[PDB]
Amino acid sequence: STDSVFLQPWIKALIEDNSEHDQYHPSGHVIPSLTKQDLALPHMSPTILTNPCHFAKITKFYNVCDYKVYASIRDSSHQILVEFSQECVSNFERTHNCRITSETTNCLMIIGDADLVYVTNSRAMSHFKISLSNISSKEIVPVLNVNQATIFDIDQVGSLSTFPFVYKYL
């Protein structure tokens, strides 16, 4: 099923339960690893369907650096920045024959093999190309690092509004 009924809040709870940025592993994975088969047919994979954590929406992308894509995603609740590893990019391209920023800001995406890591202002400035001072209340904010990703035009997504959520209520 491609129904969006499987899109439930998880980002908010995830960052709240892992607010200990000094204790949580920098590369601590937050969701199960997905396969190329899962990325091929995520709407046919119960592992994904029954786990809202795998569901995400793209609101806007920033840039690409070091063969990694830097964008912003959210869910039914709050919004958080996401970095796509070189592995993620390569696999995505093989699957979809396109880039992760190829008109995906109104599409519905699925993440896999992702971990949670906290970054500073200068980091988000140098990586995501955006200072946190304008999009956060704190100098240190959580970011999602995704190794498996696949995007399908299922659910139309709104644009990136000018207001932080996860970085505002951290």
Q: What is the CATH number of the domain that holds 90?
A: 2.40.50.960
For residues 25, 124, 112, 10, the Cα torsion angle rounded to the nearest 10 degrees is 80
Domain of 39 in residue numbering reads as: 1-170
The one-letter amino acid at 164: P
Q: How far apart are CA 81 and CA 62, in angstroms?
A: 10
The coordinates were experimentally obtained by NMR
**Among the listed residues 144, 101, 92, 111, the one whose alpha carbon sits nearest the alpha carbon of residue 45:** 111
Q: Which residues, including other chains, have CB under 8 Å from residue 165's CB and lie 6 or more apart?
A: 12, 74, 77, 78, 79, 80
Count of structural domains within the chain: 1
**Among the listed residues 82, 104, 83, 80, the one whose alpha carbon sits nearest the alpha carbon of residue 157:** 104
Q: How far is CA 160 from CA 12, 71, 73, 163, in A?
A: 17, 11, 9, 8
